Amino acid sequence: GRLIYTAGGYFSLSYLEAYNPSDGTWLRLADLQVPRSGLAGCVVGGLLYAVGGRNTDSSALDCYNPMTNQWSPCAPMSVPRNRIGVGVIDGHIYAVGGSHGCIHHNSVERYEPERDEWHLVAPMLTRRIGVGVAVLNRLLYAVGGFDGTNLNSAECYYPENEWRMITAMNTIRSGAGVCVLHNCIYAAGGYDGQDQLNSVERYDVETETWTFVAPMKRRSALGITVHQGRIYVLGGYDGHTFLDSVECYDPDTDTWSEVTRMTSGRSGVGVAVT
């Protein structure tokens, strides 16, 4: 009965809408206190947090509670982080990368909801604005992005405080939807400098290889989450228009299938499931 929340986005949007893949119903919920695009979403203990983005870049961390349909302010990050990416480990929110104006972040900071406190951790090997982030059994991955100059590179964070480069992708991707499904890390979509991508690669943590799976039906700044063993990508920008298209990836048949449409097109959204 879990839901897919899309929060904020760009058409900078305040919408918080929830999709049920089991019946095609959308619900519109309480707005983001402050519109934001370029933000990330993630869930801790049933709570949905919206991080970073921009309205002016944003350091805001807000918390949405399905049980109250109310957005609660949290302590802000140590710096603004637009085009951020986030992951959770042990109930802690890791916010990696992003940009504050011309400052392209390689720093990473961790929020403990228990104390409402943000705290710095070991920065990355590379500045990554538009970074993709996912976590696989307490390893945090930052994938792609753009360092202020040039990334196919990916790197991995072990919490117990050092980042390690991993195998590079087959593709240069900033603004790529990144997730973990099963024991693999997916990097769907992105922007290679030239084109929006519809291709998707997954890193098998156990063969340390990026292999392409079927292409999507193109997009950047797309939302991405998992729901009932399936990847859902939301909206994004295909180079010409801001898509309302929501696409679902079934790993069993290795196909991407459009599965719904958002009530309005957006990119720059934060997405999570709870």
Ligand X SMILES: NC(=O)CN1c2ccc(c3ccccc23)N(CC(N)=O)S(=O)(=O)c2cccc(c2)OC(=O)CCCCC(=O)N2CCC[C@H]2C(=O)Nc2ccc(cc2)S1(=O)=O
Subset of residues 151 to 210 that bind ligand X, contact rule: CB under 6 A: 174-175, 191
Is there binding between residue 227 and ligand X (CB under 6 A)? no
Is there binding between residue 221 and ligand X (CB under 6 A)? yes
Is there binding between residue 50 and ligand X (CB under 6 A)? no
Identified binder of ligand X from the candidate list 220, 225, 245, 260, rule CB under 6 A: 220
Is there binding between residue 15 and ligand X (CB under 6 A)? no
In the complex with ligand X, the residue whose CB is nearer, 49 or 146, is 146
Task: For the CB of residue 87, give the shortest distance to ligand X in the complex, in Å.
Answer: 16
Is there binding between residue 245 and ligand X (CB under 6 A)? no
Subset of residues 125 to 144 that bind ligand X, contact rule: CB under 6 A: 129-130
Is 36:71 a contact under the CB 8 Å cutoff?
Answer: no
Q: For residues 89 and 132, what is the distance between their CA atoms, to the nearest angstrom?
A: 16
Q: For residues 159 and 87, what is the distance between their CA atoms, to the nearest angstrom?
A: 12
Is there binding between residue 59 and ligand X (CB under 6 A)? no
Is there binding between residue 54 and ligand X (CB under 6 A)? yes
Name the pairing type of β-strands 16-20 and 4-7: antiparallel
Q: What is the DSSP letter of 12?
A: -
x/- letters, 82..121, toward ligand X (CB under 6 A): xx--------------------------------------
> Residues touching ligand X: how many (CB under 6 A)?
19
Cβ-count burial 84-104 (b if 16+ within 10 Å, e if not) = bbbbbbeebbbbbbbbbeebb
Residues 6 or more apart whose Cβ sits within 8 Å of residue 140: 87, 89, 94, 96, 133, 134, 156, 157, 159
Q: What are phi and psi of 40, to 5 degrees?
A: -115, 155
Q: Which residues lie near ligand X (CB under 6 A)?
A: 10, 37-38, 53-54, 82-83, 129-130, 145-146, 174-175, 191, 220-221, 237, 267-268
